[PDB]
């Protein structure tokens, strides 16, 4: 019970951290549609190509 509990909280906290970073990665580019989205960021903080 403890081990499922600790893996659950760690996994949820990790995914929360990651999705937070995902947002904080895309939003600068999201907001500024006309810039170039660096390829590395494009593939890693995986992104739609905006117009």
């Amino acid at each position: 019970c403890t081990c499922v509990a600790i893996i659950m909280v760690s996994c949820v906290t990790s995914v929360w951290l990651l999705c937070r970073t995902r947002n904080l990665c895309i939003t600068p580019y999201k907001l500024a549609p006309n810039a170039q989205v660096p390829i590395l960021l494009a593939l890693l903080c995986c992104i739609k190509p905006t117009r």
Binding site: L24, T27, P28, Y29, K30, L31, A32, P33, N34, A35, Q36
Partner: protein, 155 residues
């Protein structure tokens, strides 16, 4: 001066405390300021939050996508038009004359000669005979960046 229509005010307890502006088929509004945008179609959209820029941003709905401003990061220093008058850009700082703007002028777009928005104003600090504006701009690469002179106070 004529494109200033597309910014519309927010109503907070019945009074205007700020403005929401539509650019790039995306409506923006400062986070710090509360209210409901004074029109119906833009009142509906769930506005997503961007704390690190103090900007709530949302996807303007369909039928007025072609009715929005454009923007560029190309910002040579000089005079740039703005609702209350000109804003002089120099030493990587936007500054308007002393005392113009204040409470309620947040979210006001700053345009260039060709109607393209260069920044949205969020605050200010009065230095000497001028007042420097804390804004949200796009850098030379063009990613969004909050620019705040020291001691800027939200509007």
């Amino acid at each position: 001066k004529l494109e200033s229509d597309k910014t519309f005010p927010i109503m907070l307890n019945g009074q205007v405390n700020g403005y929401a502006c539509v650019v790039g088929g995306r409506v923006f509004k400062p986070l710090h300021v509360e209210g409901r945008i004074d029109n119906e179609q833009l009142a509906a959209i769930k506005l997503k939050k961007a704390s690190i820029y103090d900007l709530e941003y949302g996807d303007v709905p369909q039928c007025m996508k072609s009715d929005t401003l454009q923007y560029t990061s190309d910002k040579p220093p000089g005079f740039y038009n703005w609702h209350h008058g000109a804003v002089q850009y120099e030493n990587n700082r936007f500054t308007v004359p002393r005392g113009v703007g204040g409470k309620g002028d947040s979210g006001r777009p700053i345009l260039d000669n060709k109607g393209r928005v260069v920044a949205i104003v969020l605050g200010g600090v009065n230095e000497g005979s001028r007042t420097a504006l804390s804004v949200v701009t796009w850098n030379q690469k063009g990613v969004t960046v909050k620019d705040t002179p020291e001691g800027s106070e939200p509007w």
